[PDB]
Amino acid sequence: GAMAPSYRVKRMDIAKNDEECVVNAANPRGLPGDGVCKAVYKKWPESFKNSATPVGTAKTVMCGTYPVIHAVGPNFSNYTESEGDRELAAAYREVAKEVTRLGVNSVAIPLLSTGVYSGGKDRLTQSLNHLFTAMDSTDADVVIYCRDKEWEKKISEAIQMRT
């Protein structure tokens, strides 16, 4: 566990993270994909061996000794708002289980279902609140990665609000 478990946010490529493991925003088929998933494929391609897993689940595959947690959020183009919300909450709950099992002191995590799985809606708050619900009972340092300058400010504000 971290000595004083924290949340932080950085605006940069999650493939350059300084944490003990990474959460991939994976597809269910273990394909290279696009966005975070393609960055993760280029950095840790060995972690895509038997990484396919259903929506709402996470599956960990080691790249050397570095754990890649493949978390499959719902594509809101295909899911109803109700069932997509349930699957998005469930994926983050499975991430917290994996982070705990691995015994890591820190994890790098993207906001699941906020990019090409968002069904064209802003889901910052929805996705971040499900991240907090899952991760608040864990003692890992959590570092959230994002790419947009306005999203960085809003995630930082949400973290600081609770402190």
Ligand X SMILES: NC(=O)c1cnn(CCO)c1
DSSP β-ladder status, 106-110 and 58-63: unpaired
- Give the footprint of Cl ion on this chain (CB under 5 A): 12-13, 146-148, 151
Q: Pick between residue 2 and residue 12 the one whose CB is nearest to ligand X.
A: 12
Among ligand X, Cl ion, none, the one that 39 touches (CB under a kind-dependent 5 to 8 A) is ligand X
Q: Is 30 annotated as a binding residue?
A: no
For residue 109, what is the enclosing H or E element? strand 106-110
Q: Is 115 annotated as a binding residue?
A: yes
Q: Pick between residue 83 and residue 122 the one whose CB is nearest to ligand X.
A: 122
Q: Pick between residue 101 and residue 153 the one whose CB is nearest to ligand X.
A: 153
Report the 10 Å Cβ neighbour count for 67: 21
**DSSP 3-state of 101:** helix
Among ligand X, Cl ion, none, the one that 151 touches (CB under a kind-dependent 5 to 8 A) is Cl ion
Count CA atoms closer than 13 A to 29's CA, side-chain side. Answer: 4
Minimal CB distance residue for ligand X: 39
The answer to whether the CB of 69 falls within 8 A of the CB of 21 is yes
Tokens of 82: 């109700």
| Dihedral in degrees, nearest 10, Cα atoms 8, 24, 121, 124 | -10
Residue among 152, 84, 142 nearest 113 (CA): 84
- Give the footprint of ligand X on this chain (CB under 6 A): 13-15, 35-36, 39, 115, 145, 147
Q: Is 79 annotated as a binding residue?
A: no
Q: Is 13 annotated as a binding residue?
A: yes
Among Cl ion, ligand X, none, the one that 96 touches (CB under a kind-dependent 5 to 8 A) is none
**Cβ 1 to ligand X shortest distance, Å:** 26
Q: Which amino acids are annotated as binding site, given as ranges?
A: 13, 27, 35, 115-117
